[PDB]
Design a protein around this nucleic acid. Structure first.
Lengths: 73, 262, 180, 124
RNA sequence: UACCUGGUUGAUCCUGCCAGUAGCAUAUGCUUGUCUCAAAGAUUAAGCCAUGCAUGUCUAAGUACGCACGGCCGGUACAGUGAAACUGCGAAUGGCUCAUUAAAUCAGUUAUGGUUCCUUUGGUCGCUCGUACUUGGAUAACUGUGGUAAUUCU
RNA sequence: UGGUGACUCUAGAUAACCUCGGGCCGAUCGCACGCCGGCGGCGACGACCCAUUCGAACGUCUGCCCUAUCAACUUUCGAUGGUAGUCGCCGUGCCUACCAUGGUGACCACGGGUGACGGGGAAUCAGGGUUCGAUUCCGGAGAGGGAGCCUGAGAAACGGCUACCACAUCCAAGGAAGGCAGCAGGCGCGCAAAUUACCCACUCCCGACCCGGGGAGGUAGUGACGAAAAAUAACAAUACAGGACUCUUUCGAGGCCCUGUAAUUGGAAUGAGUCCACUUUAAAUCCUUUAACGAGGAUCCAUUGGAGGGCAAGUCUGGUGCCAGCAGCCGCGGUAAUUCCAGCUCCAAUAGCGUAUAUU
RNA sequence: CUCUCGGCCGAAGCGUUUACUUUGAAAAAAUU
């Protein structure tokens, strides 16, 4: 497609809304999350560690708390 | 369909219009009128495809709405008006009168006539009935009904009608030994003297016609138009005098005209 | 519906046997002799001759005084004499069956330009036609498979706008003359 | 100089008030000759002012010799404005077309269709 | 162009199929300089549809009291152009698809002496022995007052 | 009176009828205006009825694929026919009533199937044939599925209406609105198919209409479905090399062509491209016509399949070692592989060439 | 192959009927 105008912007948005979704399996079996906001409060600043508040929309399966959480990096 | 058709494709048009194949999807659908659509000329085809006065249907409409075309002495502005057999076309601005008469190849020739001849026409009587307080009526092939005709006029005879008044001037009876044109079938456009008719009751009558060159043929009775008394005609004739040359003779005449004019 | 025409032809046939050495040698001989691009030019000429021979065969089964046979045979023989394959004396319907492929390969504008001395080989003829150096009568002809009619043959010339005709030396000569 | 104007099949249309013709243009070295001096040469050929004559459909043949087009010469400029198609008049600047697209007027037509009374003239 | 070759055995001659061979279409792979034509959501799903468009229309000649207008010449009933609206006509054509459908459709061939038909064209239209120098009541557009979240609602 | 092959036809004469949900017998508009206080010329709308045209609709005769693991079928609820009616635009079991007991079938009825709309036609083909035809022309059919209707000359209409069924949209929860098997576009489906572009200029169609409108249709875009034409070099001189003509016993000696290698030279000729302009066109694009620039091989560089046989083209070199693989078929590969993987080389067609499938 | 009506000829039957064969006219355009 070509993108120059706002009419073509609406046409491109209309294309992106209605498409055959490609499913990735690794996303599908686990419970993933993109971080929309991040808040940090340290238990001890000298330890340089504390609890972190990651807020976003869950995407994969149902998120259970008993399972561990991997931050990608 | 759910009602009458109003369009006509070029492919399904009659072949004697000599239309193209790649100019368009549609041919001019002839109007309802005094002639059947299969065997007429719409005015637009005559006025641009034969006479080359116009180049588009727009120019044809522009010529007609100035009221320069007269068909049978009356001004027609419908560009798809069905103009058919024995038909006088008058253009008074250029001062030229044509008649629609067939060629030997089955096609409406542009036949330029003298304006004295443009005063009358010939009509073949389709039926005769008495009606409405004992008054007799003719119905011709032009859907003209003429009240009070001569009692000698019977069906398949040819009356001669002047166009200004519209009444009968003089008639020719269908008789073996009378000049004829063929207005349908493979022999369309050939002129010869009737030698015989044979009658099939409950069916069609086959009429036998002998050419001036002695080539005999037959048609149905519905495809025969009486032109003249005896062997002479009552109208003017196109360039070929109604004789169908075989393709060998046509090739010979073509080559002779090539050799003569170089 | 569209006001378009869908009628069209394939102008050649591919042979039944793919690898027959006699056919391969004969076809390469025809290509090399008349400077053709590929086998399909040979097959096209062969297709045209086959159609003419089919028409002649069909006319020969008809009666000698049949009108169709006389008329179509006269037209067929006239067309074969006009392009320069048959001669006027040998103009009979059974002599069409004595026609070969090299008769039709001789009437090509490539072969005629080479035969007239305008080129110095047959490949030089094909190039010189493609270069727009050759006109016929007054029309510049760009096609090498143009069949030269017999009346048309007497004036095949060098295309007045060509460098080898009227003048105007070309791109290379103009560049080289504009050196010093 | 080397440009030539010749006239093939010629007709006097007294019904449309014009002279119809086919023009052959010989211009052996140059490009396809512009319409304007075709009208000039055709005006000197036929002794009429060049503002009443209209030429169109010029297709240059392969090789670069002739160019054949159609031409017509009107009796007067008023008859030209009465009989010419609007695009051939606008090529002389004698007419102008509306600048609204088809889409704009289709949408305006349906929007006006949705209302009634002289409130049709308000919407657009 | 009225054409065949490989393969059953130790070898032979058969039967015989398998495979090759050439076209034509559908898809697909790799590759693709120039030019003329040109098919193209039929096959599976006559499955489902956002949005926009695809059918409207006035001549000198049905109805003009929108100053909407430059504008007459002025007591000139109605100068002219004219929105809107009423009236008339068309919207039954065209376009798409091929689900159904097996003497059904359809094709050729004939019938309507067994019917209907806007329009066009021609005829007919003081052929009736019994307020008219012109009858009546409404209603649109327009003015005004509104209803409902909402509709080409009223 | 007139006519048909044939009327219960057309016309005539008589007695009446003539529908209030009613039949014709003009309360209509424009233009010019003119002659013996009155007459008028063209036209536009009208109009019952007769013909004409465009039809349409029911009938006539013949013709359709597979199936007997379909042999009897039809008639209680019309099946076949008679009589009277009803209804219908008309003929008819079209419906009703009363009667008769018929009608069809191995000459394949009845039933079922069909990846069945029918024709014109298409592919192939000696001759005979086999197969295809959704698809632009003609005919039918249908607008999600049935069913019913209004209006009208014409519709059982669907870019009309009314229901039900199945979907589904907006809601303030009361209600309201729907129908792409039109053009474009989307999802889905799949092996399988284009732009939400421009115009009514052409072809024609509609309307009160010379003027308005038309996704009809035209124009570009996509497009290796398929068809036509057609580049990727040509030439000359040198150096080797053949084959010929002349003279020589021969060897040889030359001026006669031809050939490639040119890790040799050389200028000529061009389009592909870049690009003014004219032209084209409704406006453009493309083609055609034209200036300027544009070619020496490290470029402006041709592919796709093969090289045992069938079947044209290597018993070449390296790797592998019954593995990996090839191979439509016969077969190859287990340590010298003409067959795999490669390098070189050759062969076939060529701007195309492979594969899968249906079909001849 | 022939008896009657009309100008040697046209009308009237033909002839047991077909099948077959030849002619004629009818058989859309596009396609071929």
């Amino acid at each position: 497609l070509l993108l120059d105008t706002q009419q073509e912007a609406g046409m491109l948005l209309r294309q992106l809304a209605n498409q055959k979704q490609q499913h990735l399996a690794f996303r599908d079996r686990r419970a993933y999350l993109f971080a929309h906001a991040v808040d940090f409060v340290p238990s001890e600043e000298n330890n340089l560690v504390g609890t972190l508040k990651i807020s976003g929309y869950v995407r994969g399966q149902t998120l259970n708390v008993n399972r561990l959480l991997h931050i990608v990096g | 369909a759910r009602g009458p058709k109003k369009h006509l494709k070029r492919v399904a048009a009659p072949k004697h219009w000599m239309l193209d194949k790649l100019t368009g999807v549609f041919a001019p659908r002839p109007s309802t009128g005094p002639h059947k659509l299969r065997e007429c000329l719409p005015l637009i085809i005559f006025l641009r495809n034969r006479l080359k006065y116009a180049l588009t249907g727009d120019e044809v409409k522009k010529i007609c709405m100035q009221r320069f075309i007269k068909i049978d002495g009356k001004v027609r502005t419908d560009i798809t008006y069905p103009a058919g057999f024995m038909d006088v076309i008058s253009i008074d601005k250029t001062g030229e009168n044509f008649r629609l008469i067939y060629d030997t190849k089955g096609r409406f020739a542009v036949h330029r006539i003298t304006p004295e001849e443009a005063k009358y026409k010939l009509c073949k009587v389709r039926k005769i009935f008495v009606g409405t307080k004992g008054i007799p009526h003719l119905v011709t092939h032009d859907a003209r009904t003429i009240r009070y005709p001569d009692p000698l006029i019977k069906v398949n005879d040819t009356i001669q009608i002047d166009l200004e008044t519209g009444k009968i001037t003089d008639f020719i009876k269908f008789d073996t030994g009378n000049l004829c044109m063929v207005t349908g079938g493979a022999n369309l456009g050939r002129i010869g003297v009737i030698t015989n008719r044979e009658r099939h009751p409950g069916s069609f009558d086959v009429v036998h016609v002998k050419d001036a060159n002695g080539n005999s043929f037959a048609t149905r009775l519905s495809n025969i138009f009486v032109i003249g008394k005896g062997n002479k005609p009552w109208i003017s004739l196109p360039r070929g005098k109604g004789i169908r040359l075989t393709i060998a003779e046509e090739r010979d005449k073509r080559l002779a005209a090539k050799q003569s004019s170089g | 519906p569209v006001a378009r025409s869908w009628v069209c032809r394939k102008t050649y046939v591919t042979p039944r046997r793919p690898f027959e050495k006699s056919r391969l040698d004969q076809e390469l001989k025809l290509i090399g002799e008349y400077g053709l691009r590929n086998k399909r030019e040979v097959w096209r000429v062969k297709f045209t001759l086959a159609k003419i021979r089919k028409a002649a065969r069909e006319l020969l089964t008809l009666d000698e005084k049949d009108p169709r046979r006389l008329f179509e045979g006269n037209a067929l023989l006239r067309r074969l004499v006009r392009i320069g394959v048959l001669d006027e004396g040998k103009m009979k319907l059974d002599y069409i069956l004595g026609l070969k492929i090299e008769d039709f390969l001789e009437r090509r504008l490539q072969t005629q330009v080479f035969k007239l001395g305008l080129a110095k080989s047959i490949h030089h003829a094909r190039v010189l036609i493609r270069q727009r150096h050759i006109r016929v009568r007054k029309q510049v002809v760009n096609i090498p498979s143009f069949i030269v009619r017999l009346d048309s043959q007497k004036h095949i010339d060098f295309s007045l706008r060509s460098p080898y005709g009227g003048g105007r030396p070309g791109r290379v000569k103009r560049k080289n003359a504009k050196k010093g | 100089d080397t440009v030539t104007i010749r006239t093939r099949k010629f007709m006097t249309n007294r019904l449309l008030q014009r002279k119809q013709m086919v023009i052959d243009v010989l211009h052996p070295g140059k490009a396809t000759v512009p319409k304007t001096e075709i009208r000039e040469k055709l005006a000197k050929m036929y002794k009429t002012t060049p503002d009443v004559i209209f030429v169109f459909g010029f297709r240059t043949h392969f090789g670069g010799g002739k160019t054949t087009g159609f031409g017509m010469i009107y009796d007067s400029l008023d008859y030209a404005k009465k009989n010419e198609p609007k695009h051939r008049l606008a090529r002389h600047g004698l007419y102008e077309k509306k600048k609204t697209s088809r889409k704009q007027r289709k949408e305006r037509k349906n929007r006006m269709k949705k209302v009634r009374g002289t409130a049709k003239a308000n919407v657009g």
